[PDB]
Amino acid sequence: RTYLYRGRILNLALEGRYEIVEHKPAVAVIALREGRMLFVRQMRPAVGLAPLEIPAGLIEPGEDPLEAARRELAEETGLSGDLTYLFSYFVSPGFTDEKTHVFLAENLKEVEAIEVVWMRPEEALERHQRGEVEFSATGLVGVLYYHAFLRG
């Protein structure tokens, strides 16, 4: 593997014919409260718009997924809660190694750029189907996870 670039949140390498983008692993937090899911929106230069996401971010040096999940929830929404690991996924294994660890947050307490968007998952879904809002993988995963296991 050879490198063509080494930057802030990514390196661009070449492994023979394959173009590989190394990226720091990330976390995402699914939080539901009174039927509303905790989404967040921010300007994303990479896409020219603000998709609907859930609290998420890069794992800093020294921390593990869980600790990163806690930090992101606090920094982006000013909240904290009981976190449970759910699952993980590679965002696009065809070109990048970014891996995202997803957590569930419960019993949210308030302890303390990014827009906090509390919204019913059914509503995020309907708005998206109408072409009103775009989803990031984290936002869609949150919506689907809810519909599957949190309607109880």
Added chain:
Amino acid sequence: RTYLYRGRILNLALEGRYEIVEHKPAVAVIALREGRMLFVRQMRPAVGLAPLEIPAGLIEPGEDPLEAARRELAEETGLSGDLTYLFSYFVSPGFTDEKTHVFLAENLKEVEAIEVVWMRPEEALERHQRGEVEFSATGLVGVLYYHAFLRG
């Protein structure tokens, strides 16, 4: 926006401080048959392993999401069926613009590198929770979508 590299499936640009990876849009196909979901596995140099995915690929010049969905299903699994658009998501809006359009395939008919892995979504989930298999965003989305709307 300035460019540092222009390759096969991606360009690496710089927009001020932001490092942006332009990438062709993609499609993914969720297909269920007799309680089994249609997953696929292939060597992914970017991650050093073979995560569990669902039929997916890049939209070629000239085609739209639907046509690409049809082609990928045929080329990777030798099947075709009735396709319905479900939703889309940006794989990682923080650094790339790759957008994935997801489709549902039904009434699969056989019309005709990549390993075809028919597996119950409950089983893919359990195996993943055990650290047995990794998920790509498409594979996880397929699993969650099933648990949410296809158990009927």
